[PDB]
Amino acid sequence: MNSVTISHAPYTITYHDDWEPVMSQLVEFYNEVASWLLRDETSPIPDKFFIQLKQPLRNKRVCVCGIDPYPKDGTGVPFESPNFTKKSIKEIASSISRLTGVIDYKGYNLNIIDGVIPWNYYLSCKLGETKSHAIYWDKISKLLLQHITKHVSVLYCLGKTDFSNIRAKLESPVTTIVGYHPAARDHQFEKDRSFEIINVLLELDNKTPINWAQGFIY
Amino acid sequence: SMDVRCINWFESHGENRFLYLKSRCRNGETVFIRFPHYFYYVVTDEIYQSLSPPPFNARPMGKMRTIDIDETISYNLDIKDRKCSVADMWLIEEPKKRSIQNATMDEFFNISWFYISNGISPDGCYSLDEQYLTKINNGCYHCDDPRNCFAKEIPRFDIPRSYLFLDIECHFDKKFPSVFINPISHTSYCYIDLSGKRLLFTLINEEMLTEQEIQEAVDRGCLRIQSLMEMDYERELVLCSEIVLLRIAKQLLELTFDYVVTFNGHNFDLRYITNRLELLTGEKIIFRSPDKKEAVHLCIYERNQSSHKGVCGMANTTFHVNNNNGTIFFDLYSFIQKSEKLDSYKLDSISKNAFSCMGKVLNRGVREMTFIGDDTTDAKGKADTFAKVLTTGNYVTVDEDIICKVIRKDILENGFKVVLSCPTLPNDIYKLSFGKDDIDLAQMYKDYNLNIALDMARYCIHDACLCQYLWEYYGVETKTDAGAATYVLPQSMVFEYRASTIIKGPLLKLLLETKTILVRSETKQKFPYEGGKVFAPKQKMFSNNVLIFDYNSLYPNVCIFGNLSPETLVGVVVSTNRLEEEINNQLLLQKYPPPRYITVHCEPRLPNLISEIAIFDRSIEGTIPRLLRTFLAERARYKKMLKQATSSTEKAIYDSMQYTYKIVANSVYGLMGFRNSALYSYASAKSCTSIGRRMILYLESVLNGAELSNGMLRFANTLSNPFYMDDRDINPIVKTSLPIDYRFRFRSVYGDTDSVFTEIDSQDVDKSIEIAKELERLINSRVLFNNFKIEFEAVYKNLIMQSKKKYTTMKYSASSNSKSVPERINKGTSETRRDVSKFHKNMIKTYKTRLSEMLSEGRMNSNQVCIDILRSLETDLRSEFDSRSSPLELFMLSRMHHSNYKSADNPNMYLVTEYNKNNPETIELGERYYFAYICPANVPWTKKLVNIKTYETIIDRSFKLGSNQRIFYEVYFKRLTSEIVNLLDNKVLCISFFQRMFGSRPTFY
Amino acid sequence: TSSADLTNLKELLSLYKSLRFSDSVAIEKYNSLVEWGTSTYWKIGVQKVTNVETSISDYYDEVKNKPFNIDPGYYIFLPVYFGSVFIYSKGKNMVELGSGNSFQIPDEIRSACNKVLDSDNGIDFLRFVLLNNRWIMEDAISKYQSPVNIFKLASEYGLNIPNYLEIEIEEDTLFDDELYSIMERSFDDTFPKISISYIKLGELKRQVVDFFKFSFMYIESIKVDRIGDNIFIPSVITKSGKKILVKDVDHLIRSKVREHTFVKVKKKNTFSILYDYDTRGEVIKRIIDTIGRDYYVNGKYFSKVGIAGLKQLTNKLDINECATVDELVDEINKSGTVKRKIKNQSVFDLSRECLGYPEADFITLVNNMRFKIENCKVVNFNIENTNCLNNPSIETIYGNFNQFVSIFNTVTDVKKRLF
DNA sequence: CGAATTAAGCAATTCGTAATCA
DNA sequence: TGATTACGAATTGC
Ligand SMILES: Cc1cn([C@H]2C[C@H](O)[C@@H](COP(=O)(O)OP(=O)(O)OP(=O)(O)O)O2)c(=O)[nH]c1=O
Ligand SMILES: [Mg+2]
């Protein structure tokens, strides 16, 4: 574990050894946007912006990525709801339960499954204002997602319209799958079968499948 | 409403979908009409009766005919008739999207269905009736029955229009500006209202000037403002703060202009304004619909395009504005990129290429020269455009190299009179152009001053007016109107899509008129097929006049002549041996007579096969022939319109329009040969190519060795139709109207698809032109048939053949005489290629000129020419290497950026990616860039070159060569000497020299 | 993303698992789905492959060439026969091992193989051996059953199997020459055996043994032997009269057998088999010159260039023998499927198949000629280029082109009325 | 606050690098 | 360490 000091808040970024060749450019890019970024109250709290930088990247195979954090009650790790209140986590847990077969579950968490790293494209958002910090984060998001792509084998995007040009945003090709957002109209996410497709793709590249039943919380 | 002329059509993306029309009446009032928008499906009567939920609305379409256009191979002549069904069709409209399992005609857009079904033209003038219109707002109306509202059409009339052209200049210290650190210093506008008034004003940011300087500026004539409400547009220079500047910009961009035109404004200017406004203040730019029920903010989105070649790959990017008020935001960068080709697409390059004129020296002495321009110097119209641009210009380039500063300018009645600051030039006529400025913006920003502020104000207003100048030069309005009329598309969608989309309107109209539906039931399979025929040149240097003959629209006319459509193909007959080949030939020649059916032999589809015959029917005209007829009629109209033009601008516009229509007509063929298209027909494409080859062979055979004696003309071979026997005479002995005492011989030297290069043993050009005209008339009247005609292009003197597609010559047009100035023509040589050099071209030009002069003189004792050329080249190269006086601008090459590469290593993409990583300015996915070869200075002359691509570096606008770097001259020298050696005749001396300098083996023809 | 995509991915994975067990069609489908997947998902772990060498060795071990030991469990013993080896797959054709092609098989073998495959899902492949036009199902592998039930099923469908032996072993014996001889005798068959394939109940890997030794003997004459209609087989006899068995014509071509010389041969308790891995133009004409000019190489056999005629047409359609042209139309209408077979094919294919010419050689000969055809019938022919006559097969075929044209005209003028 | 209709063909030369051969 | 061939990419002429 290593730490670096930035000029503005949170004044301390702790990162894993797998994020070494990106930290310097991340600090350089953050120094010019922190001053304008912190003029407003943001979710999550600035202390929780860079807490996924601890996770290792050499033992991951699949990445699930959104476009923004939850507008309210941001925890810091993507796709988390300790009280099980968000609609997106509800629908994702329902799909996983339907695929597996478990009926009675108290909660679901994507940060416990081995080989799966949840991610947010934009690391911050105004309270009640979806996608209000895109200009501040653009370069950092590009750089971090490019670094994640080099290590994972299958990259899964949630949101058809948000990631319409994901291939132009990355240089080296990777196995990209884009799916409907969990809150899509017409209940489109119910008929999606992206998890089995993901497992087939990894078993097609001599990679061990992912046990989606592991993330359940009782 | 009554008389209205259409301007734009646009959609709404709210909870409820709508279609909008923007029109202006005779007086000048603007009227909006709102239309409900549906989803259009075509279903059969049985399926219509079997629809479980009743449709919202259905309209009968009458009896129609469905054809299966799938192609199958056949080994015998028991060919089954094509599947053809006749049934009553319906057109159903649905407010929300619906899925029908057996729905046909699914390749067309909803807007096309709206236009064609309702009988409405996108750029027509109409006389609306208010009985079918309901007023819902001041300036907006609602129409539920568009078919009865737009029933009456009226002649076209002129209306006033409004424009806005703008440009900004941002502060920067060492690199491309950044929105979070760097402010805006200037903003210029060009404002035209409906009354016809032209206003120019520039806003200067006062926050980076001292108070004393502000007081001096106000005393000098400028106006100081503190609020938005106290600005008048009738003043040129106004200085205010950054917030007031942004508020003024937001107010101006929220109006309902007809056009807002920028140059690369959708990526830099508007984005910078929006982001800076959102950073300094919390305000946003809001666009509202005509009915005021949907409000959106400005947010520029990206549309990425992919290539249809291997591994797909992204090859273009474009930025657009998401307004919904009817205003057309136009970016000249994308339009110029997609229209015409240059080495670079910066504003300076386009201005230099577009605004040029020849000038006569009128005065001399000291460090100034006075130039004069008029209709007697360059042409009719060029001086007028130069004088128009000179009203705001500051720097003029003389003789393509020297940049000069304008001191005084005088605009005469017809031309211009300008005085510049340049050294003495010892000639009489020079070339002037508007190009680069010899100013350092970074240095001027480091030490800011009032004079520098005024200078940047002038530069910014000139940049803003260049947008209008280019807008008038390229004829965007006429092209927009014509495209809306022809393609049946909204005015804001004309310059956005390729041939696969802009032909669907005419295709749908033609299908509805003909009552035909085309369907597929199998998978399309792709095979390679041959193309046009190119003849090998017989000689290099000719020294005799060469006559050029070309075919008029060869491939569309072949398609019309042979009725080559996927729905008129009887079948394809193949045989794997010489026995069934003979049997099938004998039976086919009598089952399908030759006045109605046409049979075309082709190269076999697969290696096992040895024969392939495709039979086409000509009783009923196809669809592709009628599409081609439409496009050819349009091209003929614009061609005669060009012929009637007088000024240079109109000539250029009309020539470009007819060129675009030609390209679309050929794109019809290209699509008909494209696998992923709905008009795919492998046999049709092969047949068209084969018929073209037959035509070139026929013309070459009948023209080669064709003498004329007395007043009579002789052709080499009998003139017969190479497909079937016809009723015309086949006698090769034909009357001529020429004088009796003429005697000449004719010969064929070169050809390329629709072209035959014919040689005549003469030297003057009047007789050559007269003979060519008579020969063209004779060939059209006797040799050709049906819809085939040729055209006498030009007479070529001093023609030189280098390769199969590389030649140089002087051109005399058909309408020319001996006392006329020749024009130099280069085709494929190392002077029109964008990736060769700038220093290479000068050397090859001077060396070809010297070689021509020396061959005219002529010594060639044993190897005198080769020795002299080698010695001169060695001396010149050594001098260039030692002196190093050549600037880096002469060693710059250009290349396009794209992501369509096999394998992801690809040094080119890696170089561009690293440059993007380490620099603020980014190279996009369709952007041309400059690069060169650079090596450390301590490295001496290198004999064996092991790596070359490792020394490629991207040359930015701020690039300055270091003291430990040098231009890697070896690659350029090797290329130039390899090109020069090929022109000479000796080998051993060239091999020895090339080994001595570079130690490699030269390649020859 | 949809169900169709999931099914396509699963079927592509299924094809990828069995790719050594493939042919042209399977490889084409696999390549098409690879292209679709790499287009849709922008990258896929598998790529396009085009050579594809068919192999089975992952289910086998190294052959035992000397006495060894056994001990545990029950064993099932199978024989190994002589001749070309083929493998039948799921919905596929016969494919030759090592040089995968699509061999042509009658109709009965096809029906039987298709129905035994339809019996259950879990057949990886079926092993076949061709020995003098005598198909023999030799073995079948699966992860669920044992080669006993499928053997009985094949017997009751009509394709022959070898008798399978179930035995048990307790003590430590050295599997040697005497035990091999006894167990080989226990088969009680006269067809050639070369090896034994034995399994343990449950284990997938199958191991074989081969006890032999070298020998040298003289070659006294190459002569043909009838094994059917128009089909001949090669054979060489010794001074003592021993019969050296040869798999195929290709075996002689690549083994470079020589008249009146000495060769090396591995002999076993009953017979001997000539060995391979010792140019082509010299041998391909020397053998024909030695046996007789009137022979042409028909694929993997030797065929005759006899006069043929009217009844050689009749035997192929499997109809009542006739000597009259009018009879050739009588029962064809009465026949339910004979006329369907007539109408489905073309005149050239049936005419070529009636006299048994090779495909490629005859096509080349026809493409090197000129014809004068009147009323869809051939009346004259001649040669244009004589280089093709260097091949002995081409000249032997040109020997009786008259019979071909006669039967061609007959079939054409009877097709004019049969349809 | 949720969504979201694209795409012309082949022939010819020049240059660098990877792959195979005396 | 030469010689030769093959492939991909870029640009131009039809
Ligand atoms: C220019 C061009 C030609 N072609 C094909 C079709 C043409 O028949 C053929 C010959 O090229 P051109 O000489 O350009 O053909 P044209 O006969 O249309 O010319 P014009 O009417 O001006 O005399 O090349 C294309 O496919 N695409 C193109 O962009
Ligand atoms: Mg032409």
Side-chain angles (χ1 to χ4, degrees), chain A residues 167 173-176 192-193 196-197 200-201 203-205, chain C residues 1-2 6 9-10 13 39-46:
Chain A
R167 300 188 183 185
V174 72
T175 304
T176 72
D192 174 72
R193 301 178 69 88
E196 299 167 68
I197 290 171
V200 170
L201 293 173
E203 80 197 355
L204 192 146
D205 201 1
Chain C
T1 301
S2 178
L6 183 63
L9 284 174
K10 298 298 293 295
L13 190 65
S39 176
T40 295
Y41 297 98
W42 201 35
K43 184 178 184 293
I44 283 281
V46 299

Side-chain angles (χ1 to χ4, degrees), chain B residues 633-838:
Chain B
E634 291 280 352
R635 185 187 172 190
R637 185 179 67 189
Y638 275 104
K639 193 181 288 186
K640 68 181 178 67
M641 203 168 327
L642 162 65
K643 197 166 91 53
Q644 293 183 15
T646 46
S647 179
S648 60
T649 300
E650 294 294 328
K651 294 213 271 213
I653 291 164
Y654 291 151
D655 189 311
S656 296
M657 293 204 57
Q658 63 85 30
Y659 198 75
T660 61
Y661 281 118
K662 174 179 127 164
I663 291 314
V664 170
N666 290 331
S667 296
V668 167
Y669 181 76
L671 272 164
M672 182 179 72
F674 184 44
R675 183 178 182 270
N676 288 123
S677 183
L679 280 46
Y680 185 48
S681 195
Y682 180 68
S684 310
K686 284 182 73 173
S687 314
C688 185
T689 291
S690 307
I691 294 175
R693 262 177 282 148
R694 294 292 296 273
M695 294 298 102
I696 190 167
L697 289 178
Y698 175 48
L699 191 52
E700 194 267 304
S701 66
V702 69
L703 264 184
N704 199 340
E707 66 183 2
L708 73 164
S709 66
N710 290 318
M712 269 314 282
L713 188 153
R714 216 207 73 79
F715 299 94
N717 296 115
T718 187
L719 16 109
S720 43
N721 179 281
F723 306 117
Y724 49 82
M725 207 76 181
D726 208 7
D727 52 356
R728 315 170 308 112
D729 189 358
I730 62 170
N731 183 241
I733 307 297
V734 176
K735 300 288 95 176
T736 80
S737 83
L738 294 174
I740 301 299
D741 69 89
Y742 278 136
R743 191 182 300 274
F744 288 115
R745 299 286 177 90
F746 277 73
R747 187 169 72 130
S748 176
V749 291
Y750 182 81
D752 194 352
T753 317
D754 59 358
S755 168
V756 176
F757 283 29
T758 307
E759 182 183 1
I760 177 170
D761 62 358
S762 161
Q763 294 279 3
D764 57 349
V765 301
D766 287 326
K767 298 203 293 182
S768 295
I769 285 157
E770 161 200 307
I771 294 162
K773 287 192 189 183
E774 192 45 83
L775 186 63
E776 163 196 352
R777 179 169 74 61
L778 283 193
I779 292 174
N780 271 357
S781 66
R782 297 293 299 273
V783 180
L784 295 183
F785 45 87
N786 275 3
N787 49 5
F788 287 106
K789 293 182 183 293
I790 45 178
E791 159 162 331
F792 168 50
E793 294 294 328
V795 165
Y796 285 178
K797 309 174 37 63
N798 299 321
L799 181 62
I800 306 196
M801 294 296 172
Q802 287 188 206
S803 84
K804 295 187 79 169
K805 288 185 181 293
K806 293 180 175 65
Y807 56 90
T808 62
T809 187
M810 295 296 172
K811 157 161 170 177
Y812 291 73
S813 296
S815 72
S816 176
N817 63 7
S818 64
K819 272 76 177 174
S820 296
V821 65
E823 184 183 1
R824 188 149 179 284
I825 300 278
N826 297 114
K827 292 286 187 182
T829 45
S830 69
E831 293 179 353
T832 62
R833 305 185 83 81
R834 291 176 285 180
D835 62 340
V836 168
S837 195
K838 184 67 69 67

Side-chain angles (χ1 to χ4, degrees), chain B residues 550-554 754:
Chain B
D550 197 279
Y551 270 91
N552 288 7
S553 297
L554 181 62
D754 59 358

Side-chain angles (χ1 to χ4, degrees), chain B residues 464-614:
Chain B
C465 282
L466 265 174
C467 283
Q468 188 182 9
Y469 299 153
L470 285 164
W471 171 273
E472 288 178 20
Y473 179 74
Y474 276 106
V476 185
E477 271 198 304
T478 44
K479 293 183 177 62
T480 293
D481 291 331
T486 311
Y487 307 144
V488 187
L489 276 182
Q491 273 93 355
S492 63
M493 293 177 70
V494 169
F495 307 107
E496 294 294 328
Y497 305 126
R498 297 183 149 114
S500 304
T501 291
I502 64 176
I503 72 167
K504 289 192 180 160
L507 187 65
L508 183 50
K509 274 151 71 146
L510 183 63
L511 287 184
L512 278 175
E513 183 67 27
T514 304
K515 317 163 169 39
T516 304
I517 308 185
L518 305 178
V519 295
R520 287 187 185 283
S521 62
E522 293 179 353
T523 183
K524 292 178 282 292
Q525 191 60 256
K526 176 81 199 146
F527 306 92
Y529 68 95
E530 293 179 353
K533 182 169 176 61
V534 190
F535 289 97
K538 300 191 170 151
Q539 306 183 192
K540 300 186 83 183
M541 293 180 183
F542 283 93
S543 71
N544 296 115
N545 292 324
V546 184
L547 271 55
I548 310 301
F549 292 108
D550 197 279
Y551 270 91
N552 288 7
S553 297
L554 181 62
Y555 280 7
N557 284 317
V558 161
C559 294
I560 291 170
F561 165 77
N563 221 47
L564 312 177
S565 197
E567 61 86 20
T568 45
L569 165 77
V570 176
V572 186
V573 176
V574 294
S575 307
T576 47
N577 63 7
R578 290 181 183 268
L579 198 147
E580 270 78 6
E581 176 175 2
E582 284 291 330
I583 296 179
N584 291 335
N585 273 300
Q586 306 216 336
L587 294 174
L588 188 153
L589 194 61
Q590 65 182 357
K591 183 159 208 253
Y592 295 114
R596 159 166 165 204
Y597 302 98
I598 176 169
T599 67
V600 187
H601 295 260
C602 304
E603 193 269 329
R605 182 171 301 172
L606 290 159
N608 58 7
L609 308 165
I610 68 159
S611 178
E612 215 192 358
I613 304 164

Side-chain angles (χ1 to χ4, degrees), chain A residues 1-184 187-218:
Chain A
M1 294 299 291
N2 309 84
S3 296
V4 296
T5 301
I6 50 179
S7 280
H8 316 89
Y11 318 101
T12 296
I13 297 166
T14 61
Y15 61 95
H16 198 271
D17 267 326
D18 305 1
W19 300 90
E20 167 65 36
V22 60
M23 280 312 108
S24 178
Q25 196 170 1
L26 172 51
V27 168
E28 183 178 1
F29 281 150
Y30 191 71
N31 281 350
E32 71 182 2
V33 309
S35 178
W36 308 86
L37 183 63
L38 277 296
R39 275 153 47 230
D40 298 311
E41 277 177 56
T42 53
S43 69
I45 297 89
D47 291 331
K48 304 292 174 68
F49 277 178
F50 302 125
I51 64 170
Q52 303 276 273
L53 269 63
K54 291 171 170 25
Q55 297 294 321
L57 283 176
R58 277 170 58 86
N59 63 7
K60 306 290 200 274
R61 314 187 269 283
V62 174
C63 182
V64 291
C65 168
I67 199 68
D68 59 344
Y70 294 135
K72 296 183 290 294
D73 308 287
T75 63
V77 308
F79 283 124
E80 183 172 64
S81 181
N83 53 4
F84 191 68
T85 44
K86 288 331 170 304
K87 169 180 295 296
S88 303
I89 193 66
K90 274 175 181 63
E91 196 148 352
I92 288 162
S94 178
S95 308
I96 295 300
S97 177
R98 179 186 296 177
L99 175 58
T100 44
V102 193
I103 301 166
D104 274 299
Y105 58 93
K106 291 279 183 176
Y108 194 54
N109 189 13
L110 289 172
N111 208 1
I112 303 299
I113 316 185
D114 291 331
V116 172
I117 170 164
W119 193 247
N120 279 331
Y121 196 55
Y122 302 139
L123 281 82
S124 194
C125 176
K126 267 182 99 63
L127 282 72
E129 289 199 2
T130 286
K131 297 196 206 179
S132 295
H133 293 288
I135 48 172
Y136 308 110
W137 285 116
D138 189 75
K139 294 187 182 178
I140 289 147
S141 66
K142 300 291 180 68
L143 183 63
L144 293 192
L145 191 52
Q146 270 172 5
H147 196 71
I148 291 171
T149 292
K150 280 172 226 312
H151 291 82
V152 301
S153 163
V154 176
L155 192 151
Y156 175 37
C157 307
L158 281 76
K160 299 298 293 295
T161 60
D162 301 334
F163 292 92
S164 62
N165 300 116
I166 194 50
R167 300 188 183 185
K169 299 292 180 68
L170 304 176
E171 317 298 317
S172 81
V174 72
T175 304
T176 72
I177 172 168
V178 287
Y180 307 100
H181 203 253
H187 293 291
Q188 279 162 350
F189 190 58
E190 271 172 35
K191 298 173 73 174
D192 174 72
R193 301 178 69 88
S194 297
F195 300 99
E196 299 167 68
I197 290 171
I198 282 174
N199 279 309
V200 170
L201 293 173
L202 309 137
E203 80 197 355
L204 192 146
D205 201 1
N206 290 48
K207 290 286 191 313
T208 63
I210 301 299
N211 188 24
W212 298 113
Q214 189 172 348
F216 281 100
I217 311 176
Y218 298 105

